[PDB]
């Protein structure tokens, strides 16, 4: 009996080109073909989202029917461009973006338009089962169309149940979408919240033709049947006739930047920073200014100035293994780890996501726990040995082999690489000038500068710090780090034979024996907790606690080491690239008292120190020696000095910790639920909520740590060989990457051969990487030398970098220097070295038996003859069959 039903009578019963030809006819559009291809390219600026309805809120909110403010909750966010347009309004203080996601829907995207810090855009959450939360502006945009119109009247009824149950705060205003607003049932549904909460209907002028969507905004104060009746006259006024053509209109734009927010900053001590501010600020005084729009809430902003274009997210692909591997183009994992970033967009976004994080200070009773097991732990290893110094020639010859290769400077002798930069005299002179400063008390040359590299599959697609933010100190203060503290890096001051806890120094080839003789402990399972955001969650009273090694050092050595931990750790400064308007990537300078870096080489001491602390603490809760009634003042120092001086060394006889990682095995199963105190320190876990008890592993042959599950294998002789492993995709996609210094054909050829050797040593047992491996061994010339850097762990020995025949190298590391292998009768054929099992490797991501792998695995000499054309035929090669 209504009018809008004959959309679904005529348009249903008639043909296809009438629907398609009608559907674009006579409707108000906005020109969008640019950013559909422009923001596809990757520019994080443009002041407008890849959405459609931001113009709808432009028309409506500018039209005056809606004036949002304060806190805003979005719903059915999709691409979230509604919220991006909401961000520009000069009353908005927070926006929560909540949407469904999943397959068959539309995931969000992260464009740094204006107002960047103030978004909280969260995917995943389904709002079928969401608790009602307060706001100040409410939005919903979930709309689906049907043939029989009551079917979508049903969905209108559901969503009016969801908002009608939602809006119970009495908030300020709203903007709600209505699917099918031509029922009396909607008028009965509406009139309660009209006599109460008001608003009404406005047809969006820029909607499409063949749908009758109308928005119950909080503005249209009409008698509703006058409005519905009026636009419902415009329904049949805009029903048929001639093909009235398209009207276009200019698109919305605001620009980029980031809106200024409130800050929970702490007043620093300016008398340990300020002269570096006088250095850069008195160096760049004309370019100097104070951005009021600092996106800095837990840190400490102190002005800014302009900056050049630096950094690139254009780290290309190794073409070689690309041209060797057919089916490792089609999978999205090998493309998943292709390109990270150093661009100011990337630095600012990793920064916002998981750096600016205020932590609550834990209680003082926990602090005495820290000082007891800390100072006990120092004096425990202080009983064995004493601090020493180390020297410069150790550091030249140390950086000669591999050490870091991190070539970025700040002072004026900006050169290519460190390995020639060591061959200057003058940096020794200015290093000794900063030794005059720090040895007297001043400081001018301790300034971090990070890069933020995160491991994204496809651009601008939902991931917060998949690889961690990495800070850079300049090399000279890295030497003052080195001489100041780096003896622990050198002479095994937390190795297993000294500290009894951690197996660093050992590579990644013998660790499985260390857990496999952790198998003989009684009681517990493999308890392999992982910690989300390690370096983000280390508080000030951990590194204020760390200075207890000053009780053991030599006197002037205590002045320099205590000095530098005052100068780079107790306080610190970073400068930070930030994109802004017009591409003017204005770089700031920033401060925080409290977190550690990640680039300094003495950080192994602090972290493996720090979690041996926290997990001795967790294991003594796991023996119920401590209780939650022991948080505030004290109960007994004698209970914990007793538990240590009877227990503690014997407990850490049986765990393995490197970096932030841990793997323990207690004698009970109580460890899985010893959790309170730890959350008082605030070291939360991964994939387990805040109080849920943990999960063990009675089996040991797959317990994960340092991204490796370990397998043991048996020979044709019958020889127990523990081998490391990881899922095949995440390594074959590591050889695919090219770093940005491999420009030649020779550099990519030798680096690809470095991956060939590293995989030839450890990862031999799989079927795939062997055929890959000896394949590319035939490709690159025998005459050449593999160089470069495959892994990034400290466990990389650099063993497989030689030009030697690899049978000898396997036979060395995997017969000779094995204590844990007894009968050292040598291998002859690595061809007659057998494999891992079939299905277990298929658990780890193989594709044997598949058609592609079988096909190009039946013709390979041609495939390498491709590259033996592509590189010169004046070389020396080898058979590998």
């Amino acid at each position: 009996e209504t009018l809008g039903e004959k959309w679904k009578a005529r348009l249903n019963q008639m043909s296809a080109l009438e629907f398609y030809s009608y559907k674009k006819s006579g409707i108000t559009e906005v020109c969008r073909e640019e950013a559909r291809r422009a923001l596809k390219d990757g520019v994080a600026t443009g002041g407008h989202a890849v959405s459609r309805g931001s113009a709808k809120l432009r028309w409506l909110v500018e039209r005056g029917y809606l004036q949002p403010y304060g806190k805003v909750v979005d719903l059915g966010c999709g691409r979230g461009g509604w919220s991006y347009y909401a961000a520009t309004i000069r009353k908005v203080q927070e926006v929560r973006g909540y949407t469904k996601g999943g397959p068959g829907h539309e995931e969000p995207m992260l464009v740094q338009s204006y107002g960047w810090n103030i978004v909280r855009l969260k995917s995943g959450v389904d709002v079928f089962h969401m608790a009602a939360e307060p706001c100040d502006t409410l939005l919903c945009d979930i709309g689906e169309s049907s043939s029989s119109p009551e079917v979508e009247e049903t969905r209108t009824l559901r969503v009016l149940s969801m908002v009608g149950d939602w809006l119970e705060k009495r908030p300020g205003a709203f903007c709600i979408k209505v699917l099918c607003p031509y029922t009396s049932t909607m008028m009965e549904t509406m009139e309660r919240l009209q006599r109460r909460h008001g608003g009404g209907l406005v047809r969006v002028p820029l909607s499409r033709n063949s749908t009758h969507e109308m928005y119950w905004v909080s503005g249209a104060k009409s008698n509703i049947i006058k409005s519905v009746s009026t636009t419902s006259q415009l329904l049949l006024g805009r029903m048929d006739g001639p093909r009235r053509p398209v009207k276009y209109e200019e698109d919305v734009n605001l620009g980029s930047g980031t809106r200024a927010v409130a800050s929970c900053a702490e007043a620093p001590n300016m008398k340990i920073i300020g002269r570096r501010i006088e250095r850069i600020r008195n160096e760049h005084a004309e370019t100097w200014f104070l951005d009021e729009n600092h996106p800095y809430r837990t840190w400490a902003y102190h002005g800014s100035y302009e900056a050049p274009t630096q950094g690139s997210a254009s780290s290309l692909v190794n073409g070689v293994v690309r041209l060797l591997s057919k089916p490792w183009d089609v999978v999205t994992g090998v493309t998943g780890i292709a390109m990270t970033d150093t661009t100011p967009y990337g630095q600012q976004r990793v920064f916002k996501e998981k750096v600016d994080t205020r932590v609550p200070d834990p209680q003082e009773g926990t602090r005495q726990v820290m000082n007891i097991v800390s100072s006990w732990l120092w004096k425990e290893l202080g009983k064995r040995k004493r601090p020493r110094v180390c020297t410069k020639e150790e550091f030249i010859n140390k950086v000669r082999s591999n050490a870091a290769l991190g070539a970025i400077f700040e002072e004026e002798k900006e050169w290519k690489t460190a390995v020639e930069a060591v061959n200057d005299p003058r940096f020794w002179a200015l290093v000794d000038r900063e030794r005059e400063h720090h040895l007297r008390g001043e400081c001018h040359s301790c300034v971090y500068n990070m890069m933020g590299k995160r491991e994204k599959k496809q651009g601008e697609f939902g991931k917060a710090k998949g690889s961690r933010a990495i800070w850079y100190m300049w090399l000279g203060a890295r030497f003052l780090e080195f001489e100041a503290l780096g003896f622990l890096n050198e002479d095994h001051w937390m190795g297993r034979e000294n500290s009894g806890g951690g197996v660093e120094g050992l590579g990644l080839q013998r660790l499985g024996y260390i857990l496999e003789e952790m198998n003989r402990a009684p009681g517990g399972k493999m308890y392999a907790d992982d910690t989300a955001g390690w370096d983000t969650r280390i508080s000030k009273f951990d590194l204020e606690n760390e200075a207890l090694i000053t009780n053991q050092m030599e006197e002037g050595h205590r002045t320099l080491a205590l000095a530098v931990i005052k100068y780079t750790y107790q306080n610190k400064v970073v400068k930070v690239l930030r994109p802004a308007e017009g591409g003017k990537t204005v770089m700031d300078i920033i401060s925080r008292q409290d977190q550690r870096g990640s680039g300094q080489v003495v950080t192994y001491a602090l972290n493996t120190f720090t979690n041996l602390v926290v997990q001795l603490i967790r294991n003594m809760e796991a023996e119920e020696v401590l209780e939650m009634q022991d948080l505030w003042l004290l109960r007994k120092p004698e209970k914990v000095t007793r538990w240590l001086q009877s227990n503690g060394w014997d407990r850490l006889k049986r765990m393995a910790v490197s970096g932030d990682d841990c793997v323990v095995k207690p004698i009970d199963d109580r460890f899985a639920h010893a959790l309170r105190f730890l959350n008082d320190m605030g070291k939360v876990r991964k994939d387990t909520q805040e109080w849920k008890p943990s999960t063990g592993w009675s089996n040991w042959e797959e317990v994960p740590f340092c991204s490796h599950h370990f397998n043991k294998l048996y020979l044709k002789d019958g020889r127990s060989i523990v081998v490391p492993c990881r899922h095949q995709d995440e390594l074959i996609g590591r050889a695919r990457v090219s770093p940005g210094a491999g420009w030649s054909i020779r550099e990519t050829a030798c680096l690809a051969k470095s991956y060939a050797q590293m995989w030839q040593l450890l990862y031999f047992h799989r079927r795939d990487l062997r055929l890959m491996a000896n394949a590319i061994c035939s490709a690159v010339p025998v005459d050449w030398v593999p160089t470069g850097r495959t892994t990034w762990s400290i466990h990389g020995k650099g063993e497989w970098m030689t030009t030697e025949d690899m049978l000898m190298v396997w036979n060395r590391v995997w017969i000779e220097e094995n204590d844990h292998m007894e009968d050292k009768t040598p291998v002859t054929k690595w061809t007659d070295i057998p494999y891992l099992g079939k299905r277990e490797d298929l658990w780890c991501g193989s594709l044997i038996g598949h058609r592609p792998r079988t096909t190009w695995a039946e013709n390979i000499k041609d495939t390498v003859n491709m590259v033996r054309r592509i590189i010169g035929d004046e070389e020396k090669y080898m058979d590998y069959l």
Partner: protein
């Protein structure tokens, strides 16, 4: 001017056509490693071991890839439908001069060649986006609305293009006076030459075209008869439309009129149309197209008032393709008829 632009669109459809051919040709294999991983991970019943998370991401980005390839398929749907909608008025306007000046081309043969090759090719390619999910579909994707909505829209698009792309080049004329068409004495030769000017053909069999004469005897006078005492067809093997093109000349055919109004001899109507049983890629569609109004004579003096009749409608008949002419026409302003007879004897001699 016009030809190079429309051939630039034939280049555009070749370009995006082959590019989308590539994108399908990889999405089938991304489907293949997906059904392997699900196939063997599903095998082996001997939590959240990251194989769930990886195969989540494989399904997810396969889903997004299917979305994108359907989106660019829409982007060439709008483009080639604008190609057709602008392609048609050239056909009917060149039809208008083409038998406006019969008083005494292969560009479009090529354009229907490439036109139907691109449409049937995109059809046949679109017929097996099914089998990229008929292994295991198992997702709430755009998978059916795409293949059958867009299958349907391009199905009616090439059925309307097949509906209005079978025309006649050569009108019937005398063998005795090859300069005077539209006039056939009882027993004259049906001097016609048409064409299936869309140059696609199933290579299966040697196809034929049927005539069809005078669908409706009108109100005025359903005229007597004629029986074509010659044949009514020829037969084209597929090797010869590939050789000479799909030419259909039913020339030299002769009639026999049966025996036993103010309009008279040269004022009667007999329009011949032509039944075409056309089928390519299984798409069966029948085609029929009429002719100009032709008069039938019996005597040499009827040539004069027949030809004055021929001008007397061929400049004096809008919406001319119909039955039962001559009834109420307006007379002749000779503003082009003067130039027309000027074409006639000033074509002859001076």
């Amino acid at each position: 001017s016009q030809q190079h632009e429309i051939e630039s669109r034939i280049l555009d459809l070749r370009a995006m056509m082959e590019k989308l051919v590539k994108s399908i040709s990889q999405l089938k294999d991304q489907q293949d490693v997906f059904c392997f991983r699900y196939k063997i991970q599903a095998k082996g019943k001997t939590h959240q071991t990251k194989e769930q998370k990886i195969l989540q991401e494989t399904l997810n980005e396969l889903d997004k890839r299917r979305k994108e390839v359907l989106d660019a398929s829409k982007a060439l749907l709008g483009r080639l439908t604008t190609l057709i909608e602008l392609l048609l008025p050239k056909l009917e306007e060149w039809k208008a001069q083409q038998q406006k000046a019969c008083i005494r081309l292969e560009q479009l043969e090529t354009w229907f060649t490439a036109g139907a090759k691109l449409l049937f090719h995109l059809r046949q390619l679109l017929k097996e986006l099914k089998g990229l999910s008929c292994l295991v579909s198992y997702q709430d994707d755009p998978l059916t609305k795409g293949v059958d909505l867009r299958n349907a829209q391009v199905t009616e698009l090439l059925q309307r293009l097949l509906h209005r792309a079978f025309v006649v080049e050569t009108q019937p004329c005398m063998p005795q006076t090859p300069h005077r068409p539209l006039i056939l004495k009882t027993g004259s030769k049906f001097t016609v030459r048409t064409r299936l000017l869309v140059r696609l053909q199933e290579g299966n069999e040697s196809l034929t075209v049927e005539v069809s004469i005078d669908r409706n005897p009108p109100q005025l006078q359903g005229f007597r008869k004629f029986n074509i005492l010659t044949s009514n067809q020829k037969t084209l093997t597929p090797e010869k439309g590939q050789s000479q093109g799909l030419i259909w000349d039913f020339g030299y055919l002769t009639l026999v009129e049966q025996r036993s109004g103010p309009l008279g001899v040269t004022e009667e109507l007999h329009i011949i149309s032509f039944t075409v049983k056309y089928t390519y890629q299984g798409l069966k569609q029948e085609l029929k197209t009429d002719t100009l109004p032709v008069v039938i004579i019996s005597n040499m003096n009827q040539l004069s008032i027949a030809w004055a009749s021929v001008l007397w409608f061929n400049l004096l008949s809008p919406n001319l393709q119909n039955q039962q002419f001559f009834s109420n026409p307006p007379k002749a302003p000779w503003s082009l008829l003067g130039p027309a007879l000027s074409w006639q004897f000033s074509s002859y001699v001076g």
